[PDB]
Amino acid sequence: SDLGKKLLEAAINGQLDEVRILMANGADVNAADALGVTPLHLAAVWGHLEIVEVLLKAGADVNAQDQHGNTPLHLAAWAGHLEIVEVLLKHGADVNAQDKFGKTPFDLAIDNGNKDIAEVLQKAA
Amino acid sequence: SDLGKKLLEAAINGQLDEVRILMANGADVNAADALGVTPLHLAAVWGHLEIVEVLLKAGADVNAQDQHGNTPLHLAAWAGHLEIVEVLLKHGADVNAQDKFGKTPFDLAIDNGNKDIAEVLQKAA
Amino acid sequence: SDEDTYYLQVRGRKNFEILMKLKESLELMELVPQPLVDSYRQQQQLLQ
Amino acid sequence: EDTYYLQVRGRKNFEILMKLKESLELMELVPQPLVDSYRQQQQLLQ
Amino acid sequence: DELLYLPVRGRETYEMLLEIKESLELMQYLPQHTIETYRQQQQQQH
Amino acid sequence: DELLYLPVRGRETYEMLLEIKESLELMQYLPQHTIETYRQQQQQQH
């Protein structure tokens, strides 16, 4: 039973209790699928604040990059999850991290009309 | 883009003229596709008597086998082409040739209600 | 198993043209001589 | 991007086209950044 | 008509792509007539 | 659920299988609820 895949599936599906029990049985919070996508990425994009927090607390890399150079901050910004953006900045998310098309989290926020989030990222400079 | 390929295409499509011209430009009548299927197989299953005859005259293997051990006789019998069956027997088609499931041309004839053809194959023993 | 006809709908033009191209090959499958189907399948499992 | 209708002979054909209709339509709900990440890996595996 | 190698994650998808691949690859064994007959049956269907 | 390599004869076929493979492979990135929502929306049109 490989706990990497199980933890990624749980992050996507917002299964807080499932995530907690997988970590306690030794799951790697920095487990990445074929595309370099981590549980922190997936919890961030699907708007699972509590799960984002347990993973960060458990030492989840805050500026982990997938194939595309998407960080959790990129995906939260993309997805319009302000509360999650705020936490990532707190845990030291690179505001200036660039995806492979040179988009910053700020740019992704703008492109999808997340003005509140863009204002936060501009001032978090 | 292959002479082999072009001749298989012509056999399927009953293009007698085309088959004659491809052979005269040095097409191989024993050309087989990925599955070991030959022009004689394809002319036989699609009921192209005249094309069957030009290929046999031009030295086509009468008991050529595909991946499955299908001979031209198998496919003629399957397809209900009595005139073509008769010619293949004349040119020495193995009545007892077995596909990989141990089915004979006789068996395939019966299973599809080609009684006239089955009667011929039973007696051609 | 019934030879009955089913309807389905699909959002977006490009999705339609993909499903049609497949509807075609899938429906035309029925007209391919069984012996050549079996010859194909026995070589698919030979490449497993 | 309106709605198009199509018909199909035979149950097994229908259940295949439905399974595909599903993934194709559900495509629109997959975050672009993960799509971009997938495509950038497809290039390098071809 | 080379033998190309398509990368696939998981059986569900492999098995599903295999089924489809089969219908596509097996149409080389149909007369041009038979296919045209069918597309005329479909354009006369729209 | 490892990366399997599917043999394909023909580019037209490979290219066609590639399009489809994308939609199927990318559904791994959707929550269970999102798919159920969609199938419930499809049960409605039986």
Author numbering:
A (entry chain F), B (entry chain E): 2 to 126
C (entry chain B): 350 to 397
D (entry chain D): 352 to 397
E (entry chain A), F (entry chain C): 359 to 404
Paper text:
All members of the p53 family form tetramers in their active state through a dedicated oligomerization domain that structurally assembles as a dimer of dimers. In contrast, p63 and p73 form hetero-oligomers of all possible stoichiometries, with the hetero-tetramer built from a p63 dimer and a p73 dimer being thermodynamically more stable than the two homo-tetramers. Here we report the generation and characterization of Designed Ankyrin Repeat Proteins (DARPins) that bind with high affinity and selectivity to the p632/p732 hetero-tetramer. DARPins are small kDa proteins consisting of multiple stacked helical hairpin units in which certain positions can be randomized to select tight binders for a folded target domain.
For a structural understanding of the interaction and the selectivity, we solved the X-ray crystal structures of complexes of both DARPins with the p632/p732 hetero-tetramer stabilized by mutations, thus the same DARPins that were used for the in vitro selection. The combination of an E363K mutation in the p73 OD and a K377E mutation in the p63 OD thus selectively stabilizes the p632/p732 hetero-tetramer. Of these DARPin F11 represents a DARPin with three internal helical repeats and DARPin A2 a DARPin with only two internal helical repeats, always flanked by an N- and C-capping repeat. Titration with the DARPins yielded dissociation constants of KD = 10 nM for DARPin F11 and KD = 17 nM for DARPin A2 and a 2:1 (DARPin : hetero-tetramer) stoichiometry, while a control DARPin did not bind at all. We also measured binding to the two homo-tetrameric ODs of p63 and p73 by ITC but could not detect any binding, demonstrating that the interaction of both DARPins with the hetero-tetramer is not only highly affine but also highly specific. A detailed structural analysis further revealed that both DARPins bound to the hinge region between the first and the second helix of both p63 and p73 ODs. D The same as in (C) but with DARPin A2. This DARPin shows an even higher selectivity for the p632/p732 hetero-tetramer with additional resonances representing less than 10% of the population. The analysis of the DARPin–hetero-tetramer crystal structures revealed that the C-termini of both DARPins within the complex were pointing into the same direction, which enables the efficient dimerization of the DARPins via a leucine zipper for increasing the avidity. During the expression time of the p73 peak a strong pulldown signal using the DARPin A2 was detected that was not present at times in the absence of p73 expression, while a control DARPin did not show binding at any time point.
